[PDB]
Design an enzyme around this catalytic site. Structure first.
Site, PDB file in Angstrom:
ATOM      1  N   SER A  48      -9.001   4.023  20.446  1.00 29.32           N
ATOM      2  CA  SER A  48      -8.105   4.654  19.319  1.00 29.32           C
ATOM      3  C   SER A  48      -7.580   6.162  19.707  1.00 29.32           C
ATOM      4  O   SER A  48      -7.016   6.447  18.895  1.00 29.32           O
ATOM      5  CB  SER A  48      -8.509   4.508  18.224  1.00 29.32           C
ATOM      6  OG  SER A  48      -8.608   3.286  17.586  1.00 29.32           O
ATOM      7  N   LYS A 172      -8.752  13.113  16.836  1.00 32.41           N
ATOM      8  CA  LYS A 172      -8.771  11.707  16.942  1.00 32.41           C
ATOM      9  C   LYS A 172     -10.145  11.174  17.648  1.00 32.41           C
ATOM     10  O   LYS A 172     -10.495  11.400  18.659  1.00 32.41           O
ATOM     11  CB  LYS A 172      -7.632  11.200  17.740  1.00 32.41           C
ATOM     12  CG  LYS A 172      -7.161   9.668  17.390  1.00 32.41           C
ATOM     13  CD  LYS A 172      -6.818   9.596  16.036  1.00 32.41           C
ATOM     14  CE  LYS A 172      -7.215   8.312  15.637  1.00 32.41           C
ATOM     15  NZ  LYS A 172      -8.438   7.348  15.769  1.00 32.41           N
ATOM     16  N   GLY A 174     -12.155   7.533  18.974  1.00 31.97           N
ATOM     17  CA  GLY A 174     -12.043   6.173  19.566  1.00 31.97           C
ATOM     18  C   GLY A 174     -13.396   5.559  19.929  1.00 31.97           C
ATOM     19  O   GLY A 174     -14.669   6.339  19.849  1.00 31.97           O
TER      20      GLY A 174
END
Lengths: 228, 228
Positions: A48, A172, A174
Site C-alpha cells: 500500500s 503511508k 503498507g
C-alpha cells in the site's frame, strides 16, 4: 551514512525485525541515519505504500481527474481511497493504465525494481527498498518527479495524517502479509525528516501497530515529533 | 440562510461583539448559518486574512516562485511568512506587484471592495465581509479561482494549522486593531465546513484569543471539530 546501533533498542523493545532509514534535512548539513543498512538496501514489495506513486500515475493518465471525482460500486474519492484499505479503486486505476503505461511510468520515476509483472504492487514482482522509498519521497517533496506540479501537490495533500501549527506529517503504511512498512516525512520550519521503516510481521495483524510505533519512538528520540 | 440565535451564547460568554458565517457542506444539501446577518454582510478590512489571496497574486506574478524560495533581510519562506506576523515579506510582494496588477487581480477574483488605495489590506481602503470571505474560500477550495491549480493547492497547503486522520483544518487570523477575524475551513470525509468570524477588539491584544475561541465553540456545537 550513520549506522544507528542506538536505535536497535526501539525494535527489540517490540520484538521486531526490521530496518529504518531516516533523512534529517532540518540543518544546512543533511544526515542519513540507518538501522540495518543491509535490510535497508533490500527490496520488498511496497504494498500500500505504492498508493503514493500509483495516484500520480492515475492522475497523469486521467484515470482520475480530481479530489472531487467519485467512484461508485461505498463511494470513494481519492482521499478516502488513500486513507482506507478497500482495494477496488486502485485495481480500477491499474486496469485503466494497463501494464505498458505502468511499466513506462515505473521507469520514468525509477521506482525500484521498475517491473509490474493480481495487483502488481503486492502480488506481482514490483519491489523497492527503504533507501529507494527515501529517494522517491524526497523527489516528491521537491516537486521533481515527471508529473505536473499540481498532481504532486495533490498527492502530498492526500498523504497528510496529522499536523499542528509548526509541523505536517505526511505518511503511508503498507502490509504484504509477511512484512509491513511505514514511510513519509514530517515537515518542520527548518526542513523535513524523511522516514521509511519495514519490519517482518510473523504475528500478522498483531504486529501491524509496531510499524508506526517503532518509527514514532525513533522520531521522538531525535525531536522530530511533538512530545505526546 | 439560517439565523443562529442559538450561537449568540458563545459570543456573549466571552463578552464579544461579532458575526460568523458557517457553510456546512457535509450533507448532499448545503446550509448557510449566520450570526448577525447584518454585520455578516458588512465589509471590514481583511488584514492578515488577505495573505490568502495575496500569496496567489505573488505566485501568479512570480514575485515568489516556490515553497522553497528564501527571502533575506530572519530568512522567510512562504510558509513562515504565512504562519507569522512579520510584515516585510508581503510588503515586498505588494511593491513587486504594484497597484495596477493588484487592482486587476482584485477584480479578477471579485474580492469585496476590489479597491487597493501603507499596506492596502490594513491601512488602505480594501474591505470584504464575512459572507464574501466564505464565497472566496469556497472558490479556492474548488480550485476555481483564476490561478494555476498548483498555486491554489500550494496556498491551501500553506493554510494548514492542524489535522488528524480524518480531518484537515486550514485557517487564517487577521487583526486590524479595532476588529479581528478568523476564517478558513475544516474538511471531513463528507465535505468541508467553511467559517468566517470577525469580532470587535476593544481590549486589543487581550481580545485576540476570542477569534478562534468563539469559532471553535461553535464548530464543536455542530460536530465539525474533534472533542478536545
Amino acid at each position: 551514512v550513520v549506522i544507528r546501533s542506538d536505535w536497535k533498542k526501539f525494535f527489540s523493545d517490540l520484538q521486531a525485525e526490521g530496518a529504518i532509514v531516516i533523512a534529517d534535512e532540518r540543518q544546512a548539513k543533511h544526515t542519513l541515519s540507518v538501522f540495518d543498512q543491509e535490510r535497508a538496501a533490500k527490496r520488498y514489495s511496497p504494498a500500500s505504500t505504492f498508493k503514493i506513486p500509483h495516484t500520480l500515475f492515475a492522475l497523469d493518465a486521467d484515470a482520475v481527474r480530481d479530489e472531487f471525482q467519485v467512484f461508485r460500486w461505498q463511494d470513494q474519492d481519492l482521499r478516502s481511497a488513500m486513507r482506507n484499505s478497500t482495494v477496488w479503486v486502485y485495481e480500477l486505476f491499474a486496469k485503466d493504465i494497463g501494464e505498458d503505461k505502468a511499466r513506462r511510468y515505473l521507469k520514468q520515476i525509477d521506482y525500484g525494481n521498475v517491473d509490474p509483472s493480481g495487483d502488481y504492487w503486492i502480488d506481482g514482482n514490483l519491489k523497492i527498498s527503504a533507501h529507494e522509498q527515501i529517494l522517491f519521497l524526497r523527489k516528491l517533496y521537491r516537486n521533481q518527479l515527471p508529473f505536473k506540479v499540481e498532481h504532486q501537490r495533490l498527492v502530498k495533500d492526500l498523504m497528510i495524517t496529522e499536523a499542528g501549527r509548526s509541523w505536517i506529517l505526511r505518511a503511508k503504511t503498507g502490509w504484504e502479509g509477511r512484512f509491513g512498512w511505514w514511510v513519509g516525512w514530517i515537515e518542520w520550519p527548518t526542513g523535513p525528516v524523511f522516514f521509511a521503516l519495514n519490519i517482518d510481521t510473523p504475528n500478522r495483524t498483531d504486529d501491524l501497530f509496531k510499524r508506526e510505533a517503532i518509527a514514532r519512538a525513533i522520531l521522538r528520540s531525535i525531536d522530530a515529533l511533538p512530545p505526546n
